[PDB]
Design a binder for this molecule. Sequence first.
Ligand code: NA
Length: 264
Amino acid sequence: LSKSMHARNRYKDKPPDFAYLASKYPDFKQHVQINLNGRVSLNFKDPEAVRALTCTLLREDFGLSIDIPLERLIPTVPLRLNYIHWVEDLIGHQDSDKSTLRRGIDIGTGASCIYPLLGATLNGWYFLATEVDDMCFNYAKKNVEQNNLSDLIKVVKVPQKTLLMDALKEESEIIYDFCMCNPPFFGITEIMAEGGELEFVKRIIHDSLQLKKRLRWYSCMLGKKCSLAPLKEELRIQGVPKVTYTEFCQGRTMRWALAWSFYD
Ligand code: NA
């Protein structure tokens, strides 16, 4: 039993084989080197190499061709898969059949559009995928297009200071099964400032208090350990009836997943 990865994550017992990938993908091979053990390795501080790994895994394991810039966040695939499988568990996906269409929202989808591409590819899930950043929007839209998934994934550029509520008016589906979200990167006064991550997820909580049963589950993936406790307390204060959380990692890269619901 793994403590780092979701039980159904394909990389849980089959980690990426860099020698295999280098043998097959010349664009990947040019970014690898040999370590002191004589093993094929990669410099994870180098964005070109990290990009090549992500693009290569998506191609090899998921049949997805993506194009992304060096100047925006490059996602790490094994880590992201944990969140997809966790959402599967939240919504009861393992125990239903294909006749049930699911509808998600990815808040701040990124240049990769990685959550919608994985969810649409693996499960046939629909996504509304929002993005404030122009470059990320443009890339996301092309990545969905080039993988022929625009009937499942609607990529939408949204204004700088809007979130879930603004995205879901008369245009919307009646009920969504979930939202997902990776938050964006961010001796005198005793009180610590909330910081970017806590503030951002509190905005989602605030929107959920309006939308209530229009989404079955609200979720986020947290990058700061210190986020989880205050967000649980804010959900308690507001009387949110169903709260669940879990923890994943990939090596030293740790994440805390938090989800809540107004259903019984
Ligand atoms: Na494969």
